[PDB]
Amino acid sequence: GVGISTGTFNNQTEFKFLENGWVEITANSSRLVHLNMPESENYRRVVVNNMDKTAVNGNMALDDIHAQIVTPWSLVDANAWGVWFNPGDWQLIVNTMSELHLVSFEQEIFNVVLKTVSETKVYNNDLTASLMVALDSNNTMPFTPAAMRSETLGFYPWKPTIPTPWRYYFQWDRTLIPSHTGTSGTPTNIYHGTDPDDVQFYTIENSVPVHLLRTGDEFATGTFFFDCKPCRLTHTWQTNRALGLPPFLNSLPQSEGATNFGDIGVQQDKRRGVTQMGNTNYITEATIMRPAEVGYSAPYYSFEASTQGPFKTPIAAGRADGNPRYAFGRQHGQKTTTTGETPERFTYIAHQDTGRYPEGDWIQNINFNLPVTNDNVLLPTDPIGGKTGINYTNIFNTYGPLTALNNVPPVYPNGQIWDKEFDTDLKPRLHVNAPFVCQNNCPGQLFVKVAPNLTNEYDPDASANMSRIVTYSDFWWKGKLVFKAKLRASHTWNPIQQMSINVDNQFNYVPSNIGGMKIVYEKSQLAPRKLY
Amino acid sequence: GVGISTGTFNNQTEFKFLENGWVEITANSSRLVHLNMPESENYRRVVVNNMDKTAVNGNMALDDIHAQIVTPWSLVDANAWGVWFNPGDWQLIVNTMSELHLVSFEQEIFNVVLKTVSETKVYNNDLTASLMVALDSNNTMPFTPAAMRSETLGFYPWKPTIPTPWRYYFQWDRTLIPSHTGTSGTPTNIYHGTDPDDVQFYTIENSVPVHLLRTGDEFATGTFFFDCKPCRLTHTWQTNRALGLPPFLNSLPQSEGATNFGDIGVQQDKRRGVTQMGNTNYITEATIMRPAEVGYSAPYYSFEASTQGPFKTPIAAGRADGNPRYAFGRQHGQKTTTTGETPERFTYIAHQDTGRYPEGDWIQNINFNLPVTNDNVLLPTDPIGGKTGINYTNIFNTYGPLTALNNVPPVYPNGQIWDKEFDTDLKPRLHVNAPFVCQNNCPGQLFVKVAPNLTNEYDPDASANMSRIVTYSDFWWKGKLVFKAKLRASHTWNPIQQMSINVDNQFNYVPSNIGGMKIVYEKSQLAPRKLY
Amino acid sequence: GVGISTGTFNNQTEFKFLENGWVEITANSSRLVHLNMPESENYRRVVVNNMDKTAVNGNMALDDIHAQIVTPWSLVDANAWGVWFNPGDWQLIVNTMSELHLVSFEQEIFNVVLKTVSETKVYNNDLTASLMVALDSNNTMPFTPAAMRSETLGFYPWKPTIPTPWRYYFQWDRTLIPSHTGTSGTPTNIYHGTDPDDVQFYTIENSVPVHLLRTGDEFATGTFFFDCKPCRLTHTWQTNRALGLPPFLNSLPQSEGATNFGDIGVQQDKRRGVTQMGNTNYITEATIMRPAEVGYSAPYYSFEASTQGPFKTPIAAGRADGNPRYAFGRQHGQKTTTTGETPERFTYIAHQDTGRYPEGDWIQNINFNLPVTNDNVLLPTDPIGGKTGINYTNIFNTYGPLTALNNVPPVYPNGQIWDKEFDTDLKPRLHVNAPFVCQNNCPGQLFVKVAPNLTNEYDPDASANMSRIVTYSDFWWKGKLVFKAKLRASHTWNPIQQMSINVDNQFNYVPSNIGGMKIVYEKSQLAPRKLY
């Protein structure tokens, strides 16, 4: 009946140790989730069109034109690290573990409460009303990770949280020709509507069964199981210069200090080795044949425009370009006592040295007369197409068979845990948004809604919105995400980098006078790893 | 369902008589515990700083500076004697039983009722809301015995009671250089913040499971089992002067009265026996060797300072130095019909003679010429450091390998029953606050809270505190605390001191005209026992 | 056979993971040890008498007068942390473990080579000479921890080492009456000789069976197994002021910032609680009855005289006094390429707050009037004995039955691992120099010597010392030490302090331009632990 509890609340992280240095990290999590009824029971097709902003020349990158189907449902999304680990648990993981697997995931909605607002205000229990709950176990609906809009569940167990009102992308065609300031024409900036071939109008009611939980009942998902390749909590320092055997230092220093450098004792054009610039006798530090290329140069800040308008091309690793800029509100790390709509932001400068420094690059003629003349060398200071501010590195691309990369690091507390693989025939090698990629299916999105409490005056043949007795739900969500992780080993003599509390960062991890609480970014990959 | 009770109030105590002179005393205690919702859901960090009162010189001992983590949860603490035994039961224990063991302890919360307040006031039941209940079975939370503040459950079975709002100490660093009145200038009274090395921030949600009871189901703790050493309900009178064989008396008195003393026959330098004064022939009751020292002189009213500011050095046995002074409110013994904030107070003058009388002490020179001259004896009339008010016994310690001591007596009704042993590598001989001390684990602290009963207006991103439906709960708590105790035997001819109702103390044990009740303090070690 | 190798070098650390969160840590250590022949074969009794330095008044603590037996043997001592663990392994231990047991120890000598020098210098193999090796399995000889003098095996595997020449204390009687500068005359400073009742002359030749290893043979000390209680790698932040339930705060702060404190609502004389002060109604955080006493005050820089001369009385834990100060050489952590004789030094400021701050002490009269008048309070500024520098806290001792204490922390690399328990009938609670103390037996000391290669001219009747063929030995030593440690768990929300490499300490842990090395000290007890 009504008065019997339908479950329990758990936010314990349990570390169970196993054979051979493995640990099973059972990250229990639980939250009180609050849900108002939808603005309308209908599905809407809404077009956003900021021609007011993009019609100003030069503001082409501020295009927000898109079409979306607004759904009368809300999504309970736990796909962010902050939902699962408090910072001490994260410290234990990143300091102690080396590689990290994702094992299982399960959810439960329980202790549903429904309450109506009446008349001053009087709140009364709707013991007869129901909470509609759907689990897209078959991945029928379009996938939408809430982390990329900072819309996941909250990161504090003691604060209630809300689900995101769900929406998905309808198809549209849009063209936006680039223009700079002072072009003095009108660029073609128009919206073409929808290709009829590519129309899709999903609905929760047709796609998936819906359970009508009243108050004394509980919903439990199955125990999902992943098959992902490992994430690694260790970074690589070795660029191309670091791979392989250094040259023999024939003349070592005889006294201490920084000024006493060591010298290679043989002329550069009578050294012994192998090089790929075959016409050149010089075997330098920079020209000797390495096995492969670590990382790749990319055309940074370039936009392709498919039919759906311009978009920034992704970059695998940063030096700046590449390093993501997470921005988030008060559920998700900002000081909860802050006043204002301005979000807190950080750029995650990853530890991995896989990236590039474009100002050091250059191209030069095949003849390779080493005291290069200006005509024989193309430098980052040189213009392309007459534009002083654009140089060749902005358009350059060195991706090739010899390129070697690392998967993107975890980004606690805001970043994703998992993402689903593309449905394409040829599939991307790495996802820039999440470390683990579900290979063939991913956890079903859990959609939640409060059923219509109709008024006695309702008449479906009338055109106006149906009068609904105002009702809202509070319900408890429980989740259990299991990881399998390997404890590290101290291969090297020296101590490694480790996450630590210090005088500077102390008060980020304890509340203020008035319960002001925050969570700060903590770097996931700390220990160096021998790439070669 | 809703309408079915889930437990029986029981405040009896059985005395079950086992073979071989042991009684299993089962104490049951039941209380209606009333719980308002917390002032704020967020964990707060609050520093208290009475610089204003400690900056005036001489007020060093009034130092109240501390930091604490004010917590939404409230604690149900039953660790006091008055919760379990009434004066009649306590009489039957102390008057008849020589030693007392703890056996087991268990708790049950039952018959939860949740109610909501709406503005005149109308009180309505909320069958959907839930009491949040958590048990720290693992003792992972910081231990907080409520008896030291007199915030335990109430000691009357009929009155309802309230649980203590929970809080625990945080790190802080402080220096308070002392100063008498008339000091030239201000001492360094300053607060240094918190060491990052020492930060521990605990939360119930991340540490222990939590149960969302609602109105219809119970929470029950398994039978915890103690292993503590016996508390002995009998006191020792024998000072060093009363250990061993008294001297032989040659001239016994021949008539009655106090004037007719008996005399030892032979001169003090011609007596026989063992002294521990190698250069002295006088054998006297002060000088004759004894097996060991009962009790120890300790530096009385010595305040001692750590990183966290000054504190009193505790003392194991009092004579009024050392003897504990309890201040307590109307839940816990004061006459309930009295007005005013002012607590009732007693000082527990224990029977046992393990204490000291500092004004009688003295130290004299090794040479030990008998009628000791002024220069050769240091008396308690003599000033250390020129301070007339501070004689040597204030600065004096005689703890040693020969010190013998008793455990602290039980104090009824306010004294603690059990206490947790320290996680130090070297553990103290006794705790001055409770007779029994848990060797390896102690009963789990029971935390309670009422869930956030939100309103429709809630937005987690809003800076202001969440709007909550004003909720309170009453839940019946039932405890069962089992002891095992040994019946005494009459070894002496003479009868022993006993607790008794008399014309003076009569009306302390029955209610007043308007139903006021009190519980006076009762002495727990009445029968004398043989030390040697 | 001469040429067959007799062992294998091993300096690896294996971290082997057991059930239930235990890690078996197998530290292997291997060294080359160089042993010249003794200066003379005879046992020598030598007395050191530095009257030239201590006859100057005030040079009392510079007393070095002692007697010792200078023994031809040399001791191979591995009893120090740096012999076994490098900084990376120690980082893993301190950052990831919680308690650390000590399991077993074994030793080996292998690949012995003997050589002789003939006059330019010619080096010739001594195929027939032998190295005397003696294990004192029964501990007949006095235990002699070389780490006290910083003469253990060196901490670098790739650098040879030399063993300490063995010596032990003979008995001597001494009196040194102290004096200050400007004392009237030369005080008693005399060497009395030796008490015949206490004479003990030990020879390795008579007390242990001596093995003779030529070149093709080994000696393997079988596995000794310890039974020591665990060392804890966590530190206790709570002092007495932070034990128990904090006082309830009525005036919670309503705005951010350190300058907005909370306040207790109730006046100090109307405040509920318990105090060990029978005549004081003021309950305050200094006076409230804590369970026991964490730490203790001791007479700081007190020197005490035995039969054999003055010595520093030791202190269990420091704030300064009590904190150990190490002086160590090139083998044991100093920059190996430094010129000069001066040792490198550090003072190990342990993280535990069990120490005292003597400037905050005060003692006040039993009446306890609050604005204390000068006569009624003794401060650390007041003179005692008429001396202005010495104050009462130099004499004071707070040690009592209520004292709780922590064991000595590990000090990496120069501190001991184990030490032998004293043979006294009552044994100390702790040792100030090793974390583990062997309960009944401790691993045997290994004494090494190169046997005499006599010349043909030898005659025992000759007055002069014998003639020897100048010879020395190099032998490879290997040892294995096994620990059993428990991995930590993240109880707190907040991260803990952790050992890390950073820009300040980066070049401490890696070799220099001309191959220098150092080992900087590293703190053991990092993570906080709760007492109560």
UniProtKB/Swiss-Prot annotation, chains A, B, C:
Capsid protein self-assembles to form an icosahedral capsid with a T=1 symmetry, about 22 nm in diameter, and consisting of 60 copies of two size variants of the capsid proteins, VP1 and VP2, which differ by the presence of an N-terminal extension in the minor protein VP1. The capsid encapsulates the genomic ssDNA. Capsid proteins are responsible for the attachment to host cell receptor TFRC. This attachment induces virion internalization predominantly through clathrin-endocytosis. Its main location: virion. Interacts with host TFRC. Keywords: Capsid protein, Clathrin-mediated endocytosis of virus by host, Cytoplasmic inwards viral transport, Disulfide bond, Host nucleus, Host-virus interaction, Magnesium, Metal-binding, Microtubular inwards viral transport, T=1 icosahedral capsid protein, Viral attachment to host adhesion receptor, Viral attachment to host cell, Viral attachment to host entry receptor, Viral penetration into host cytoplasm, Viral penetration into host nucleus, Viral penetration via permeabilization of host membrane, Virion, Virus endocytosis by host, Virus entry into host cell. Disulfide bonds join 438-442. The capsids of autonomous parvoviruses expose a proportion of VP2 N-terminus and part of that sequence can be cleaved of to form VP3. The N-terminus of VP1 is sequestered within the mature capsid. It contains a phospholipase A2-like region and nuclear localization signals that might be exposed by capsid modifications during virus entry. GO terms for biological process: adhesion receptor-mediated virion attachment to host cell; clathrin-dependent endocytosis of virus by host cell; entry receptor-mediated virion attachment to host cell; microtubule-dependent intracellular transport of viral material towards nucleus; symbiont entry into host cell via permeabilization of host membrane; viral penetration into host nucleus. GO terms for molecular function: metal ion binding; structural molecule activity. It comes from the Viruses. Signal peptide: none annotated. One of its GO terms (cellular component) is host cell nucleus. The chain holds residues 180 to 727 of 727 of the full protein. This is Capsid protein VP1. It is found in: Virion; Host nucleus. Belongs to the parvoviridae capsid protein family. Mg(2+) binds at residue 138.
